[PDB]
Amino acid sequence: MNTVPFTSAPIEVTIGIDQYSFNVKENQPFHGIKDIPIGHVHVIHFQHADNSSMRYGYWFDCRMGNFYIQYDPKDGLYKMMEERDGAKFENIVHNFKERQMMVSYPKIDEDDTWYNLTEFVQMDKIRKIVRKDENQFSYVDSSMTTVQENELSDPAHSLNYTVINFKSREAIRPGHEMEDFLDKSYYLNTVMLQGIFKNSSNYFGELQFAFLNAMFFGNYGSSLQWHAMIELICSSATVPKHMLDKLDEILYYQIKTLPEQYSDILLNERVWNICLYSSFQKNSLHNTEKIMENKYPELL
């Protein structure tokens, strides 16, 4: 079990850790989150009471260092930082616990939700999508745009998702125009899986990371990226059976975890109706189909 201490909480803010969240009042004695499960990535995020705009937060993995939060009154936001002095860090963490000023990561033992949402997400791949190599953790927020969004302005602050575009030379082999556009198997399996992602787990990891950013920060380009990667599979006639089964699990837990009130902006009617009911794989997402119908029959 690991700990992320906070120096203080100067401004009223809603703090989230993964799918949990806590309201913290201005200059309340809050000093961190403990009992964070080792073995997965995590995200700690913020929404100020005074600005229900710009949700922001940090992806991290405690195996990669000792991380803490500190409010910066110049930039006006909670910043994540690394403490390199291991002893100085254990000392802060031990005293804050002794004083009991830390909230416990509230995991129900039956619950595999977080594992299911992050199964293929690996901190290393996150740091290639959010490039800032002087830190071991990654900042994301509501307004960051993707590399594809930028092509159609500041690159240091971009989400470098893999660019997918169904009407591109990359996606369409000369002479297989009609074939490749109606059956994207070539694009999925040769170009994307064997070519760029190398294996299905890296692909799923980017898919899941894009979902999480859309869900936690309302990052619109991440929603676009998640939908595109779903559509590329469902629009391929030939998909490894292990990918389809895992995809149904992946999407099930994503749909399960989404707040019911956000289904309007976060779910793309066209893609979902095409994937569940028109696509080659209409019959391969039984769990995802069953939860979609019982929870969001309107969208369909």
Binding site: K167, S168, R169, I172, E177, M178, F181
Partner: protein
């Protein structure tokens, strides 16, 4: 963006552009089989590719052999159209390639776009106009060359005959669309109007009769009247 009544005169500027109409690419007859089931028999079709400014028509004849052993033919027809239009652009010298291609039916956008990926600076556009190019097979010489063909073939025509010697593109296209609208709404009457006078002939190298200026005025008014009458009949107005 889409082409509509507002941006209509753009068709007659000096940016090269082509209309593509696919309505006559896949043509069938429907008939009963010996066991009483329904079957289709394909006949020869054509792609109608037209430069509205110059009248140059690129009639790509689609031979029934194209369909042999193929499934989902109405969908394939759209991709074959796009394949053939793309090849036509590739065959033209650079300074003749169009800057825009306007498809008369929106279902052609994705197939043309994909076939034109090598031409990112050629804009593929829909239109909201209800253009009557489907009636191109009511023009006797076009229907004749399509139906006689024994192999794929491109045949070039000027769809305005020599009208541009005497009138503008705008006026030429308005005449063409009026003639074709009439032919679409009541082919028999339209064709009666064009040929009733035996002394007005069609040049071997033309598609329409050699009307004088005054005769075109009478013809166009007869086609107008034809079209309005048929409207009242259709809707009981």
């Amino acid at each position: 963006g889409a082409m509509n009544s507002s941006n209509y005169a753009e068709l007659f500027n000096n940016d090269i552009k082509l209309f593509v109409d696919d309505t006559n690419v896949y043509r069938v007859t429907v008939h009963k089989t010996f066991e009483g089931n329904v079957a289709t028999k394909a006949i020869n079709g054509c792609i109608f590719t037209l430069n509205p400014k110059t009248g140059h028509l690129f009639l790509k004849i689609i031979h029934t052999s194209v369909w042999a052993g193929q499934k989902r033919l109405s969908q394939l027809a759209k991709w074959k159209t796009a394949e053939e239009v793309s090849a036509l652009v590739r065959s033209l010298p650079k300074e003749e390639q169009p800057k825009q291609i306007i498809v008369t039916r929106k279902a052609m956008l994705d197939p043309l776009e994909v076939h034109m990926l090598d031409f990112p600076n050629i804009a593929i556009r829909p239109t909201e106009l209800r253009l009557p190019f489907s009636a191109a097979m009511s023009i006797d010489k076009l229907s004749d060359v399509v139906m006689k063909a024994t192999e794929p073939q491109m045949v070039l025509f000027n769809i305005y005959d020599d009208w541009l010697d005497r009138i503008s593109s705008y006026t030429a296209f308005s005449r063409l669309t009026l003639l074709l609208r009439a032919l679409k709404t009541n082919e028999e009457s339209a064709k009666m109007i064009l040929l009733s006078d035996p002394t007005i002939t069609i040049k071997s190298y033309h598609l329409w009769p050699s009307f004088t200026d005054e005769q075109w005025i009478t013809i166009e008014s007869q086609m107008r009247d034809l079209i309005l009458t048929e409207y009242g009949r259709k809707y009981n107005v």
